[PDB]
Amino acid sequence: KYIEYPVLQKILIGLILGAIVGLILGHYGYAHAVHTYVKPFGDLFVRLLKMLVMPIVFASLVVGAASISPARLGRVGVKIVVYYLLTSAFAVTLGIIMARLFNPGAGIHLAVGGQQFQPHQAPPLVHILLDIVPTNPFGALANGQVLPTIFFAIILGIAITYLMNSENEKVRKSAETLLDAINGLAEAMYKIVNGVMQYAPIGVFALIAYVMAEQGVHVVGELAKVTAAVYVGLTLQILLVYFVLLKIYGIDPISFIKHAKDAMLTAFVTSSSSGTLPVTMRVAKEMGISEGIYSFTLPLGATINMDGTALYQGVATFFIANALGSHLTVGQQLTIVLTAVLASIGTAGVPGAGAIMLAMVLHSVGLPLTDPNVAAAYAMILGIDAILDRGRTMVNVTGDLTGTAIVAKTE
Amino acid sequence: KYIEYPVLQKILIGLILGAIVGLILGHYGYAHAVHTYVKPFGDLFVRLLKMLVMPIVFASLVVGAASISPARLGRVGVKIVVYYLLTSAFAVTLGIIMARLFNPGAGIHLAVGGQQFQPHQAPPLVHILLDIVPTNPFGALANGQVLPTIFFAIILGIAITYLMNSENEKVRKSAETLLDAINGLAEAMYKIVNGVMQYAPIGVFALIAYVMAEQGVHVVGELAKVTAAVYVGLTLQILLVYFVLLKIYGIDPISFIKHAKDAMLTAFVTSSSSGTLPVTMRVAKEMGISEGIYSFTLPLGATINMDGTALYQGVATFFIANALGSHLTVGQQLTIVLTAVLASIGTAGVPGAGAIMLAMVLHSVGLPLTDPNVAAAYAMILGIDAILDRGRTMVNVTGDLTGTAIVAKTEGTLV
Amino acid sequence: VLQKILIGLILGAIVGLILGHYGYAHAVHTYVKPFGDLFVRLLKMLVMPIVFASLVVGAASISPARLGRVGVKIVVYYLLTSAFAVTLGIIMARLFNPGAGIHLAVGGQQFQPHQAPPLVHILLDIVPTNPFGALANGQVLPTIFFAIILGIAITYLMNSENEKVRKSAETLLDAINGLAEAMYKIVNGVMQYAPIGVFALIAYVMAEQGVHVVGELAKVTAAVYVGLTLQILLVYFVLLKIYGIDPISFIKHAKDAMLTAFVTSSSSGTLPVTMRVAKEMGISEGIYSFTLPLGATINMDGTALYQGVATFFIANALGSHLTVGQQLTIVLTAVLASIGTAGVPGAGAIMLAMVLHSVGLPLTDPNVAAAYAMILGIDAILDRGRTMVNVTGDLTGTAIVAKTE
Ligand SMILES: N[C@@H](CC(=O)O)C(=O)O
Ligand SMILES: N[C@@H](CC(=O)O)C(=O)O
Ligand SMILES: N[C@@H](CC(=O)O)C(=O)O
Ligand code: NA
Ligand code: NA
Ligand code: NA
Ligand code: NA
Ligand code: NA
Ligand code: NA
């Protein structure tokens, strides 16, 4: 009774099997059953994603503050970042534009707790800007609030790279040993991470088994409404940005696609900016780009500059809002712009943590995942991430290929 | 004004001196005094036991997940574990049977806070099975809830033994240094542990000084009711299990006891599965058992398979329940079976943390130690653990001697 | 660093009465507040980790083991000097009355001094029931009793028979220490916001009652300074003279270990300097080689006195008559703070943190905290002045103990 299988199908057959199993259960008779039996395995999966973050988000971002230690020369790739921001900023814009045309979410009245979502109005920015600084990092980290457990983790690890340097030898030996422990927790988390991706097949099955039992069936159409709103928005900015800003330069925008070939192919199948990096790296070499340019910019387009993930989140948010029976207002709309950018700037680049960074793009713009109406809707859109992750990644990689080819004009 | 003394008497003379001091105080006059003066040193001791666990239970169980790392060959001692479960399962059964015959607890109406225990009914298993997974390990660990601070500590340390292996050299150097820190906290805890066992003489005195002042005196008889319910249950399964399943095999069950001699003796005096392990190890060699058998099984009967501790907890629970004025219901009864097994599978094997694993066998089956009625009763039974620990351990060791001798009938040899 | 906060102090003093008249409405009390407050929190962050990390180090620092005979003599001395220092601070905070002449009301509802819980129940709640919890949500008096009992227990693990257990004990302590340091790195960075946030908070609390509040903080300055110099004469020049050692020429071959202590304001920087100085005044190796590094982190004479004044300052600033017993608790607290204080620049003031938490004056109360903001504000003055003694006090001890053959 054994586990072996390439998981990113295991989940996807979990999904299509879940969808097809779900629909046929609630229809035929026992609309309940699944709520009492199956859902509790989705409830499980959910929890395990959350079990992560806090350690991962601490540990990782202490490492990624020893990784970047001044000198951290952002004095020649000013050009590339300036570009990356605008594309990602325009991507989420385009997502909100696509979540206008299509209205995913509406046509579902999620009541969950015998009671629909009421939106609790945001506190002043004074008070939230100040509550990036923890009053006690341990507390902040502990009970769970994250935006201090960023500001601390960074300010610890940025300060730690001035201790390995310090005059004293034994102080540098102390600074090291702490960082050598924090890192490794980072890794140990990543070892459990993979193991959660091994329960992910069960998890996803149980989620969109429940959704398709309780609340049929033009919820299918609704989630397929997302699929399009995402997809013919993704492909709607490949034409509207890349094919545009390359043409309006002088670079050949059409044959660019042909010598990006397999950096594009894999991005869709691997669904990873990690896997599609020695492939995107080679592809820049293969279309004949200069070393110090693509050698610095394509690894910075890896973690920074997720164009598709910014757009994906700018749709998912809208989906949730309307699914709750909440008319998502303007300003909030352009907060989502600035939030989804500042999420899809820190999103992972593996498979999952696009959706599990959307997490916070919802927490911002009063829509927290504590409210069960929110969460049960999040469960839906996180359920079908496995579809809109493979499709999404393809752009995240192409957007920093195009930037690397646009900036290749500097001599 | 100096401390030196072999402590496991220091406590026990603390107890008998506490008992004899306590009774004569509340009787003669100042029934109070002790409540204001002496109890606050028992209140202290209690807290220090609790100060522990959370670090120890984390740190230890990250180590004991790097200790067992797949490959962790449970492919030949399937036999021994299969046995161990049934004995421990039947032990707590027998404890609940003994806590039926004897009714310890009842005949005390513990009101503590001017108000008796009311039992708050258990939540669905769905919701408690799910709350083994922490939503935030740090939080879980922090404010104190433990069953996530297990599931995390294990899943960290099990995952950590696939990082020292990992292709990268410097990643294995990072994984090590974390585990080399967590371990050592484990040890540092164990250094305070010993220091608490050095206040334990005071602590125990102060506990069963207070109990014997406020609430005399057929509380003596009540706690002695426990003593028997435990003891003539312990000895009631030596005859009923070991002397039975060895006889119904063909192995000589009576002379087994004679070449176990000093593995039994020390178990009662040392009150330790740690101390009685080179002794139980030798004793298996001395009664002529095969190496690869007792060399693998007697160290696994060390921490897993505590027969007596399972039974002890299956009585202590019942004691508490009835002491509160709470008729401990069935199902709960057989939850105690499954709980006390899954406590006496992880109990320590030093002296204390039989009682301080009962801790959780009470938290399960709605009887938490937050409630002062519970806790003041727990203070009683944890008070006299020093009596029912030495007596208890003797079985915990004998039960995996017998298993090792029962499984010694398997021969043999592969291609 | 000093001349950015003392011109800091007068870009607060005046900008309050020239933007409490020309400066209209909440707008000028906005960017006072947000910048008072993006200090306040930014400050409050530090206290806990530091108080844990530091006091695990200052329990491996003092360990009943390998302290002897060379190291029984020196500590015995160090305790008494630091114990007598904070005594002298409380004596100086008697003569001068800093704090009084300010009625800090903060939350329209001044600090009504809070009456001390039954002592049974607070003595018991020094022992944490779960250190993690205690540390986490913030309560400190357990996060002392644990941190100490961890690091005291840890110095019996590096010793332990097993080699690999000593390698494990080390690596933990080598991580905790370093967090200590990492904190001290942020510490300095907070002292860099201290100008435009602790003389932006000051910007308002010098905007009201101005003709009695500069000269209240300058009242501290003296109470500290002519107490520091008042024990150089009263202890060192005394106990060296009453021995036979030449107490006056001692100062001359300490020269640059004294100089730097005032400019560097660091027991870290003034350690290869104080080390050399002991060599240069011709002290024996195994003596000053063991004692001057133990006078580094243990034995802060000035920091003990500084805290024994700062506390009193705060108390009286609140409208709270700081009672006796509390007075001699401060003696035993400030010693057991200035035994674990950092020896960089900041974490004298950010160990006073806990000497206030002890003796019911916690920093959760905004009346306390806004007053702490004042005295932590001008630490940059009384840190350079303070350090000079912290170093001289273990030079003198090293020279006093140099008489053993
Ligand atoms: N699938 C994304 C990462 C994510 O958003 O989860 C990528 O690799 O680009
Ligand atoms: N005394 C037991 C351990 C315990 O239950 O506390 C043993 O060593 O077997
Ligand atoms: N400035 C002190 C340290 C402190 O109290 O912050 C020293 O170096 O001695
Ligand atoms: Na990317
Ligand atoms: Na990203
Ligand atoms: Na055993
Ligand atoms: Na056990
Ligand atoms: Na010093
Ligand atoms: Na110090």
From Swiss-Prot, chain C:
Assigned GO CC terms: plasma membrane
GO molecular function: amino acid:sodium symporter activity; chloride transmembrane transporter activity; identical protein binding; L-aspartate transmembrane transporter activity; metal ion binding
Chain positions recorded as Na(+) 2 binding sites: T297, T341
Residues that coordinate or bind L-aspartate: S265, S266, S267, T303, V344, D383, N390
Cytoplasmic topological domain residue ranges: 52-69, 150-185, 241-249, 279-286
Transmembrane segments: 1-19, 31-51, 70-92, 111-149, 186-207, 220-240, 287-309, 381-401
Residue numbers on the Extracellular membrane side: 20-30, 93-110, 208-219, 310-326, 362-380
Membrane topology value: Multi-pass membrane protein
Gene3D superfamilies: Sodium:dicarboxylate symporter
Example of a GO biological process term: chloride transmembrane transport
Binding positions (Na(+) 1): G295, N299, N390, D394
Subcellular location(s) per record: Cell membrane
Classification via PROSITE patterns: NA_DICARBOXYL_SYMP_1
Keyword match Translocase: no
Keyword annotations: Amino-acid transport, Cell membrane, Chloride, Membrane, Metal-binding, Sodium, Symport, Transmembrane, Transmembrane helix, Transport
Stretches within the membrane that do not traverse it: 250-278, 327-361
Recorded family membership: Belongs to the dicarboxylate/amino acid:cation symporter (DAACS) (TC 2.A.23) family.
Record comment regarding domains: Contains eight transmembrane regions plus two helical hairpins that dip into the membrane. These helical hairpin structures play an important role in the transport process. The first enters the membrane from the cytoplasmic side, the second one from the extracellular side. During the transport cycle, the regions involved in amino acid transport, and especially the helical hairpins, move vertically by about 15-18 Angstroms, alternating between exposure to the aqueous phase and reinsertion in the lipid bilayer. In contrast, regions involved in trimerization do not move.
Quaternary structure, from the entry: Homotrimer.
Protein purpose: Sodium-dependent, high-affinity amino acid transporter that mediates aspartate uptake. Has only very low glutamate transport activity. Functions as a symporter that transports one amino acid molecule together with two or three Na(+) ions, resulting in electrogenic transport. Na(+) binding enhances the affinity for aspartate. Mediates Cl(-) flux that is not coupled to amino acid transport; this avoids the accumulation of negative charges due to aspartate and Na(+) symport. In contrast to mammalian homologs, transport does not depend on pH or K(+) ions.
Protein name according to UniProt: Glutamate transporter homolog
